[PDB]
Curated annotation (Swiss-Prot), chain B:
The relatively low beta-ketoacyl synthase activity may be attributable to the low 4'-phosphopantetheine content of the protein. In adipocytes, S-nitrosylation of Fatty acid synthase occurs under physiological conditions and gradually increases during adipogenesis. The active site is at H30 (proton acceptor). Fatty acid synthetase is a multifunctional enzyme that catalyzes the de novo biosynthesis of long-chain saturated fatty acids starting from acetyl-CoA and malonyl-CoA in the presence of NADPH. This multifunctional protein contains 7 catalytic activities and a site for the binding of the prosthetic group 4'-phosphopantetheine of the acyl carrier protein ([ACP]) domain. (Microbial infection) Fatty acid synthetase activity is required for SARS coronavirus-2/SARS-CoV-2 replication. Coiled coil: none annotated. The chain holds residues 843 to 909 of 2511 of the full protein. The gene is FASN. It comes from Homo sapiens (Human). This is Fatty acid synthase.
Amino acid sequence: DRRWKAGLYGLPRRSGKLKDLSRFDASFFGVHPKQAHTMDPQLRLLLEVTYEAIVDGGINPDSLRGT
Amino acid sequence: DVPAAEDFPNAAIYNIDTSSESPDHYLVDHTLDGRVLFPATGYLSIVWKTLARALGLGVEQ
């Protein structure tokens, strides 16, 4: 029941859910703490996921800057 | 129908309609003195449904 109580409104009791949504390395991405709380969890996770994707290819993201 | 300004954010309210198509059409049968009245047990059902919604269960549950 991480997102909402199971069986609510007759909904199915099973669904796939990320392990944690309340994590973000704001200081790295130049986001002030106040804006971090009001930021969409999707974007908070997607910034980190995109950075991981870029480096996963062996490409330092600085090389792509300005392109 | 188009949304209004009050549909968006900013207790339970029930509309009693005795019209034919309305689901509460049966209420027109409960007439005393020739003037229709909302049944004494009609309020009980409304409050029961409100409590059921507040808890998150159906009335039968």
